[model samples]
Target: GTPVERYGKVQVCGTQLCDEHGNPVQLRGMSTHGIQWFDHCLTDSSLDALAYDWKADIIRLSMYIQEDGYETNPRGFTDRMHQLIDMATARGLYVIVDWHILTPGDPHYNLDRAKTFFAEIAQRHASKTNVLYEIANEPNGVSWASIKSYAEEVIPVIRQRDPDSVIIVGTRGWSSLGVSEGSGPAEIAANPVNASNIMYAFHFYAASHRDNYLNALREASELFPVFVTEFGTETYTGDGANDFQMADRYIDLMAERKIGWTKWNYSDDFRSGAVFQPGTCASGGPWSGSSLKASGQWVRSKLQS
Candidate 1:
């Protein structure tokens, strides 16, 4: 087949983010997961509803592994990701393929099988233009030093194959908080890669997370291009007095500051489940907006600016 290709730079809401050469690039979008198990995974129509109806510039996909595992589950999920990437990019969107969580170890490092599999993937999509490779979603508890070493090992392998690829790396502690002077960034910078095409990744759930939310965000921005890869919680109901207030603050702050971010999820789940309490969208009776909708409006409104 011919070499892979993609758009040079895309302008969204007046923010430029197609940079592979110079100049800082930022992107904002929503994340959609759990496709294979959902009713829409089997049909293109379902995917269309998410990409277009939901107004998402990007969606996150956990790898498609085997059937009964803590990993991504289902081999077809990755294939579905490829399909979704095409769908989104065709419409001028970005796709983030996350490792989801690195509790014990990244899925890509769970077994030698993963190493071989990842090699194939890096080689396969090495030439793709709009795709971004996320090495680990959250490597909590581990030292940033260790995480950086691990990333250095894995990223170079991919880089050797995919030179122009945008390699994304996550920090320690589930990739949350920790970018202060002696925090995550300092540790990660210890073993930095020699490539200039890499982007640092972080998941954001700081809405009402704490008072230092903005300060931490500002500090992170000082180091490198930051993106709120994910942010949302189950503390809010339609009542509008919940953490929605904080969520609201964060989104508005993001727009005003011109930072890039993506909401937690797009599904209609509004109940506090294993991950969190009921989010913006309630489960039943009291129908509220999805967490993304409740706050993402702040950014959407600014898009007209």
Candidate 2:
């Protein structure tokens, strides 16, 4: 069934992500690499494949704020997001508007840009039931307390326009639940963000993160509502060969726990994390068949299953 039509509205229900009917729902889907670079991969044909073939429930719009993304042209990026949202809506797929801030590590660096962008995005797409806001991509070199403060400030901007939509806040140390910073999810469990109907983000790369990160996610989910917004079967840098076995351990655990996840990317950026080959996007995509890479096939199989 189509995601938006089936789930309608989603919210936090204790340690679970529940739909409007108060039933626990787990989202399985793809995250675009970055709109600035991989916009071509999100054509109607590719999206149709995502909906009907891959059977994806959602699409995360990883709009980078810097790195030649929204910073260069606010109007251009914002308009592009509107188009992408409408495209996903037509297919009844949930959409996550990701504020990808990576270079500086601290989301506060782009606080003004986030406030302005979320304000416009929430206002324009507020009426839509499938839209979700990701306030930050990866909050590295920052504490849970600092990230929580950022969330408290940004959550209101979206709540004022779209109160019902679920807003996801990025965690410390590249959203690794503080695992990479010599800490763990317990830090966040003790002190969380001051907002409701929201979830904290936890990202992973199986080849790079081992028992420490996996155990962190396991403990964190029990402590609070968590969503794996971005992950890869590759290393932490998002490249090299796939670690399907290691990734499966985390995937199986999430499936059993009903934890929703979005894979690292669904583009053709020559990186192993990208589902397609380097030229597939430029070719406008066959969307399937030989165009699919190992990771692409693996993720599609996961979604289909």
Candidate 3:
């Protein structure tokens, strides 16, 4: 089936992301580091390498609405997003346009900006089936009701342009699946939405979140569709030693259950979790074995598998 058809009619079937055919579909791939600063890492050569060589089936564009990104150069960021989406589409890989909300916690922090952003994005990619909208990257300290209200508002803007594309909503507490145990995606699911093809977000750093996180995710999955939009082997700060064994176990669970996932980031930063060596591929790359870090090698192997 075509990429669009393969993921079309995405719905939560028990704990699976079932396609129109009722078969579960699991997507694996890389997420670009914050585009505002790491824009150079999203060049055509790098995306090509990720799709063809690294064997990625999806690519996430992490566009931060804050963090001096949208305010400093909104046009530049939007243009880069368009470029990445086009590149991923050309390569037959899926793209997730993430509105990386942080610091402010409340989704209302950038409500107007989000509406305007998703309106444009939805219209532009309305015809493409490989596109998904991650409305919020992580919602910290906000109530699920507040997040749902924000989603209820932002969702229609996208639906007006592209009705059936998958939409991902981030949970509270930096999108920790454990939050669902008390009140989160499950709460939102109970109320439900007028929207279709929606998935809830769950994020984790294996070293920091272990069995407790996975258990919470398992519980959330039974409630509604869940997507691990960002995860890393390092600490939550995006830097530190990689707990490969823990990461592997997480991946094993995700695979066993057929949950779609995109890793924390794809960059050559000075962080332990950065897939590539810092300064090795300054203007993006045609990376090879020598240019990859330990995390990069492991990620590539998993993608190819």
Instruction: Please give the clash total of every predicted structure, in order.
Output: 6, 0, 0
List model 1 lDDT by residue over 21-58, tens digit each: 43434455655544543313323443354444444455
- Candidate 2 versus truth, CA RMSD in Å, comes to 0.8
Candidate 2 regions with alpha-carbon error over 4 angstroms: none
Candidate 3 lDDT, tens digit per residue, 194-294? 56678888998887777778777777777778889999988878888888999988899888878788987788888877788887668455475888888
Rank list by TM-score = 2, 3, 1
Task: Tell me the lDDT of candidate 3.
Answer: 0.81
lDDT of 1 at 141: 61
Best by TM-score: 2
lDDT of 2 by residue, 144-257 (tens): 899999999999999999889999999989999998899988998798787778888999999999888889999998988899999999998899988899999998999988
Candidate number achieving the greatest lDDT relative to the actual structure: 2
Q: What is the TM-score of candidate 1?
A: 0.71
Extract clashing residue pairs from model 1: 140-173, 140-174, 234-277, 234-278, 272-277, 272-278
Model 1 regions lying over 4 Å from their true place: 1-24, 35-43, 64-75, 105-114, 177-184, 189-194, 233-242, 256-258, 270-305
Alpha carbon deviation, residue 252, candidate 1 (Å): 3.9
